[PDB]
Amino acid sequence: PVNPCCYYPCQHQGICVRFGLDRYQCDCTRTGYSGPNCTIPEIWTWLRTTLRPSPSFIHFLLTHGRWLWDFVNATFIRDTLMRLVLTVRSNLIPSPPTYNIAHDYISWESFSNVSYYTRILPSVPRDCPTPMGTKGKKQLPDAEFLSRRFLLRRKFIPDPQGTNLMFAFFAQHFTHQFFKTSGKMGPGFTKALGHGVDLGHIYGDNLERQYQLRLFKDGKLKYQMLNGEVYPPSVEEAPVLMHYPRGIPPQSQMAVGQEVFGLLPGLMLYATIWLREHNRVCDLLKAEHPTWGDEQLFQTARLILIGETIKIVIEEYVQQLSGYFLQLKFDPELLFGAQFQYRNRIAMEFNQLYHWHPLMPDSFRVGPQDYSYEQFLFNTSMLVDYGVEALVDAFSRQPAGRIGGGRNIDHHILHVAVDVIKESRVLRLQPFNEYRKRFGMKPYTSFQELTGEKEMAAELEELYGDIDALEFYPGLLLEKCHPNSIFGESMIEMGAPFSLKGLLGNPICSPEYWKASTFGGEVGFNLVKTATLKKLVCLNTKTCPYVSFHVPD
Amino acid sequence: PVNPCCYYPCQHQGICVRFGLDRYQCDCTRTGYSGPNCTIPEIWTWLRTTLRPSPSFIHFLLTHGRWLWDFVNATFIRDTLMRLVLTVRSNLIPSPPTYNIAHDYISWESFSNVSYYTRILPSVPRDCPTPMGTKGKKQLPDAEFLSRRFLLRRKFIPDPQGTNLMFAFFAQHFTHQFFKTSGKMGPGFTKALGHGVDLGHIYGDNLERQYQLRLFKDGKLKYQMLNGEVYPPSVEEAPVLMHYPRGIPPQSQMAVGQEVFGLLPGLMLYATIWLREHNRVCDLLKAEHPTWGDEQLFQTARLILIGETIKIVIEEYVQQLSGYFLQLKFDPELLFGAQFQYRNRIAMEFNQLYHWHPLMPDSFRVGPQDYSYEQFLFNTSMLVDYGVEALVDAFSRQPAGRIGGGRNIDHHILHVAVDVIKESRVLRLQPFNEYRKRFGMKPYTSFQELTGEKEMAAELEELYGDIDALEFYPGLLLEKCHPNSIFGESMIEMGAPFSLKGLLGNPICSPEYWKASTFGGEVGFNLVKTATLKKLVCLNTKTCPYVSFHVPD
Ligand SMILES: *[C@@H]1O[C@H](CO)[C@@H](O[C@H]2O[C@H](CO)[C@@H](O[C@@H]3O[C@H](CO[C@H]4O[C@H](CO[C@H]5O[C@H](CO)[C@@H](O)[C@H](O)[C@@H]5O)[C@@H](O)[C@H](O)[C@@H]4O)[C@@H](O)[C@H](O)[C@@H]3O)[C@H](O)[C@H]2NC(C)=O)[C@H](O)[C@H]1NC(C)=O
Ligand SMILES: *[C@@H]1O[C@H](CO)[C@@H](O[C@@H]2O[C@H](CO)[C@@H](O[C@@H]3O[C@H](CO[C@@H]4O[C@H](CO)[C@@H](O)[C@H](O)[C@@H]4O)[C@@H](O)[C@H](O)[C@@H]3O)[C@H](O)[C@H]2NC(C)=O)[C@H](O)[C@H]1NC(C)=O
Ligand SMILES: *[C@@H]1O[C@H](CO)[C@@H](O[C@@H]2O[C@H](CO)[C@@H](O[C@@H]3O[C@H](CO[C@@H]4O[C@H](CO)[C@@H](O)[C@H](O)[C@@H]4O)[C@@H](O)[C@H](O)[C@@H]3O)[C@H](O)[C@H]2NC(C)=O)[C@H](O)[C@H]1NC(C)=O
Ligand SMILES: *[C@@H]1O[C@H](CO)[C@@H](O[C@H]2O[C@H](CO)[C@@H](O[C@@H]3O[C@H](CO[C@@H]4O[C@H](CO)[C@@H](O)[C@H](O)[C@@H]4O)[C@@H](O)[C@H](O)[C@@H]3O)[C@H](O)[C@H]2NC(C)=O)[C@H](O)[C@H]1NC(C)=O
Ligand code: HEM
Ligand code: HEM
Ligand SMILES: *[C@@H]1O[C@H](CO)[C@@H](O[C@H]2O[C@H](CO)[C@@H](O)[C@H](O)[C@H]2NC(C)=O)[C@H](O)[C@H]1NC(C)=O
Ligand SMILES: CCCCCCCCO[C@@H]1O[C@H](CO)[C@@H](O)[C@H](O)[C@H]1O
Ligand SMILES: CCCCCCCCO[C@@H]1O[C@H](CO)[C@@H](O)[C@H](O)[C@H]1O
Ligand SMILES: CCCCCCCCO[C@@H]1O[C@H](CO)[C@@H](O)[C@H](O)[C@H]1O
Ligand SMILES: CCCCCCCCO[C@@H]1O[C@H](CO)[C@@H](O)[C@H](O)[C@H]1O
Ligand SMILES: O=C(O)Cc1ccccc1Nc1c(Cl)cccc1Cl
Ligand SMILES: O=C(O)Cc1ccccc1Nc1c(Cl)cccc1Cl
Fold it and tell me: In this UniProt entry, which residues are annotated as the site Aspirin-acetylated serine (chains A, B)?
């Protein structure tokens, strides 16, 4: 019989619905296109497409000509373009969410059950001739061999954008609040039910964990004093599930919102920094409202820290990553005259996309010392030994690896990428070319056009058989890179829409929540508006070291 | 020190926030007002208030002049006005939701924890001089004595709008999918985590329950055959928790989505019809899609039945109790050019408001038979004995009681109204007049202005002391009802914003969901678009009885 939806016949966000025994129909509703396969353009769509500049042209404009951008940033155009960046990107993501691992169709279970990761494109049907649809071979390339030949680091390729480990660990810390895949429920299921910037990696994904982390006085979190410095509490003081190597003494075990943070000094670094910020905010709130109870001081402080995150993420984190000459601005009031949905659901493709393990180097240089992976991983002493000040300085000076290009994942953590590709076939993600079309890009006609070179393309031509069979995750990390950039063109075009919908879709960005009273007055509101990475560290430390998302020079 | 927020100083949705020892500050952001109390209006605010007609004047316009409304309904002005009713009403509701029983302030916990009912106006602070704020007596009037003197039915007062029991049972059935107060967690908590029209009273509030009702063949729900007619299955066949009187084994019980439905035949009547509807819809969808599995057939039928519910509710259910000459219309497309959040959280005020126990008659009539409360309540054979047709005919012919005016609750179920007022004091709901202001109405200056008479006004003035001490629920029922109507001025103005935000805020009404493909093509899309109370009943029965929300002339 053969399922007609395996060919992906519907174009431009049309929906393949199986009718009768062998036929199909495309629902081209509000797609801007008509006809059986949604290809005949409406008057406005045809006009827009011929007048639309290429995605690369827009990226070129945003990365060149300082004289124009010095002017733009000092004018109203900054706010006009930022609004355009917000609206155009985030509208590519369905809201309310559509599909999940169980349903390749809209249902109430896909809407209400927040334990699911959502998906933009439906899974490849289980009745297709090839696991990627119709094109390609019956068996996809070996996940170990594909990572070994194309992803394994032979030499450290530094990021030309000057990105450091301070960014890398921020990226990991920030993302692991909404990427919490369930080990028992399996792939496609999440434990971070907040689905965005909830800070559940500081406070906990569940209520009882939070209560266990809370000192229940002045709204503050629990903490311990080691060498005159404030650190996260021990397991004895806060009895919560923490993933530590079995046998390790409880005095060496620290307790934070996310279970996996104790395994890396870079992760527990930010956990300390943010904990110091929470209690600091409580002190400012208490001086402003001495009549407030413990519960209000905590909840008000959480929203301030949620606002501080989004501020730093957009104006510094994205600023370093995108390399835009356009000065980015966190201002929810930009969307106040627009049709925007203040909700978010984490997609599995955003999970796959955010596996930036190439960022990690060969070693971890802290001052005169150079620490290996076996010296750095699962180390429960390093954070206390050096302190926040010394480590933040050390991570801001060490270069990070280039994400795109290829052959840049250190062999110690390569197994992750292997499992990511394995998870992609379990989830049955559509080919890379299908996602290219979903995010408004032209699909690649050959492997030579993808990598931009002759060598690595020829081997991939033999393995996959066809370009329309190329997988999602390998495509993003093997795509040609414009010199000076951190990754390929697709990463920006696929990632930004998710990322902005997660940031600005946070309820605090809504007209209902974006008020002074929400953050306990003007003091709390200004802390959100003026927050910086530098102010996140140095205000919570004795001295102020070099702190940035980029290395010196 | 005296709490300043006990005076409710901040007007027009301004937020009272405690500062220092004895000081307060109003957050007048986006209220349309400025200053210390949000009392001085902006240029556009002053313009709106002076040109705005009174609530009772627009209600007058909608309920008078047949000839003008015949013209309007046949033109685009029908759609123009419906869009206005949709937008202006539902915007009075905070979205995303703000407060709950735990927090009288915006928090992440209030946003994320869906086990809470939300609220529109914050509670009366615990450290206020009087239980209702600053007004009235130290001890609030007795709950049982208030119900016996002002709410207890002497002579039966029927609805002047000719509303029947078919409406009354629909009301109780329809509401108990989003009104499910958790007796274990307490007042202000809810098991109905859908917070809207999810049909959890048919399928279940949780997944494990839903799976027990489902056949897992053809997307259908389980059913038993009695007298050659389709009925809900036994609890012996579908093992789900149902609240039946002790001594009644699962062999006689019937298994449906909502636990309390076995207590009333009228509730079980509507459980049957929708179950017959679900399986009838499954049959239609199976013919269009013979390659669909069980899971897709079930989920798609649910979306259709949700679509059918909101359709009938707006164009007939709301049409009956509103008494508008304007032909109401369910078209989600009306909101596609508007700022509208497709989400809903059930408020405690909507819960309190929807206690329409006055609708219930002195005795239930089924043709020549007249069954009392003892015979009707907990009856297990009445539905099977008579059938669907006979009971639909009976409930459609018998008039329901007038909700407003007072003194129209039968002595059998008066204890509910006692528990509503008692729950209101635990929830610490603000005074009636404070809620009047919040839904754009002038507060009553006296009890005589509220009632319309003299006797009950003077006795309430003795019990409460002040009009600003009057409670939410008693105020709604003892209010004066305009020209021949179900209830008073406030019931529309307070309940309509809650309802329309609940109905149109359903995700199926969003541009993403409101497609033909979501309902499995045009056949499923038309069943929503052409849904009727009559078509819900007569298409699922052998013969077609009298079916309406009003009695025959
Ligand atoms: C949405 O929100 C509601 C309401 O908040 C919530 O309902 C429940 O919430 C919690 C449980 O999740 C219940 O909490 C109650 O309060 C006491 C607190 O007293 C003490 O608790 C600690 C003692 O217990 C612990 O002891 C040791 C450590 O001390 C520990 O090792 C044990 O494992 C044990 O847990 C103590 O540390 C602390 O200092 C306090 O003195 C709890 O003990 C107990 O759990 C109580 O039941 C609420 O009562 C629940 N219901 C209500 C109505 O409030 C929902 O869970 C939430 N929903 C979601 C989906 O998140
Ligand atoms: C977790 O991380 C902590 C980081 O604090 C580790 O603790 C530290 O471990 C080092 C050993 O590596 C301790 O000794 C230090 O190391 C030097 C090594 O010699 C140096 O090597 C270079 C290049 O080979 C040579 O040019 C020079 O000889 C140079 O000195 C040693 O000489 C010194 O004694 C120096 O202190 C260090 O003391 C210790 N830190 C603290 C605060 O005690 C820890 O090992 C690690 N844990 C695990 C389980 O891996
Ligand atoms: C659950 O509901 C069922 C209905 O399905 C109840 O069973 C029914 O009970 C009624 C009495 O309440 C039975 O009526 C019988 O028929 C006549 C009725 O009298 C007639 O009507 C009026 C008023 O009564 C009189 O003025 C007329 O003159 C006329 O006679 C009577 O003669 C019989 O004695 C008897 O009452 C009905 O038949 C019966 N149905 C079935 C199928 O058994 C059931 O009681 C109820 N459960 C509980 C606990 O009450
Ligand atoms: C969000 O959705 C998740 C996935 O649907 C839910 O995860 C869990 O719920 C599933 C369904 O309850 C679990 O599936 C299991 O199904 C087997 C099959 O047994 C069958 O059901 C009956 C068993 O009593 C039998 O009568 C029948 O004949 C048949 O054999 C059953 O054995 C298990 O008991 C269980 O129900 C599943 O284990 C689980 N996880 C996953 C990954 O599927 C979430 O509950 C849901 N979340 C929310 C908040 O609703
Ligand atoms: C040396 C440090 C690192 C180690 C040891 C490491 C290893 C791991 C491990 C063990 C997992 C969980 C198992 C799995 O999904 O394969 C994981 C997942 C993941 N990693 Fe890393 N990685 C590192 C660096 C990073 C960084 C810097 C980022 C951020 C750019 C990152 C992004 C992710 C993401 C998004 C997941 C999936 C999380 C989930 O779905 O639950 N990793 N990695
Ligand atoms: C004679 C028929 C009815 C009976 C026997 C009945 C019974 C009850 C009972 C026992 C409660 C719980 C009271 C408590 O303990 O707090 C309740 C609450 C309630 N009633 Fe009724 N009722 C009837 C009719 C109606 C009708 C017609 C409506 C109109 C919609 C209605 C609306 C409600 C609502 C919304 C609740 C609160 C639900 C919740 O949050 O749990 N009732 N009723
Ligand atoms: C409709 O879209 C389909 C995409 O599959 C196009 O291809 C179909 O029609 C062709 C011409 O009749 C056939 O050669 C193909 O076999 C057939 N595809 C499949 C999978 O069977 C088709 O061109 C489109 N129709 C129009 C009018 O453009
Ligand atoms: C479709 C009409 C819009 C005008 C598009 C002009 C073509 C853009 O051409 C662009 O030129 C840049 C350098 O100038 C390159 O960096 C880009 O790769 C290339 O796409
Ligand atoms: C001159 C700079 C203008 C920047 C404003 C445009 C930002 C919108 O970004 C656009 O988003 C679309 C959806 O993701 C993509 O299809 C486009 O390629 C991308 O440029
Ligand atoms: C100076 C401009 C004011 C004219 C706009 C008046 C709109 C208010 O509408 C008024 O509502 C009253 C009910 O309170 C009715 O009595 C009036 O007839 C009606 O015009
Ligand atoms: C001082 C001005 C504030 C009073 C506001 C009262 C306006 C009249 O009341 C209005 O009735 C309409 C009935 O269709 C609804 O659309 C509106 O939601 C309702 O506010
Ligand atoms: O957006 C983020 O938070 C990180 C991220 C990851 C992948 C792709 C884009 C982005 N951000 C981002 C955004 Cl939100 C806009 C423009 C350019 C970029 Cl790189
Ligand atoms: O829609 C409902 O649930 C019925 C309901 C209950 C309370 C208050 C209003 C309404 N309906 C209603 C609506 Cl939603 C709009 C205009 C007029 C009326 Cl009577």
Answer: 499
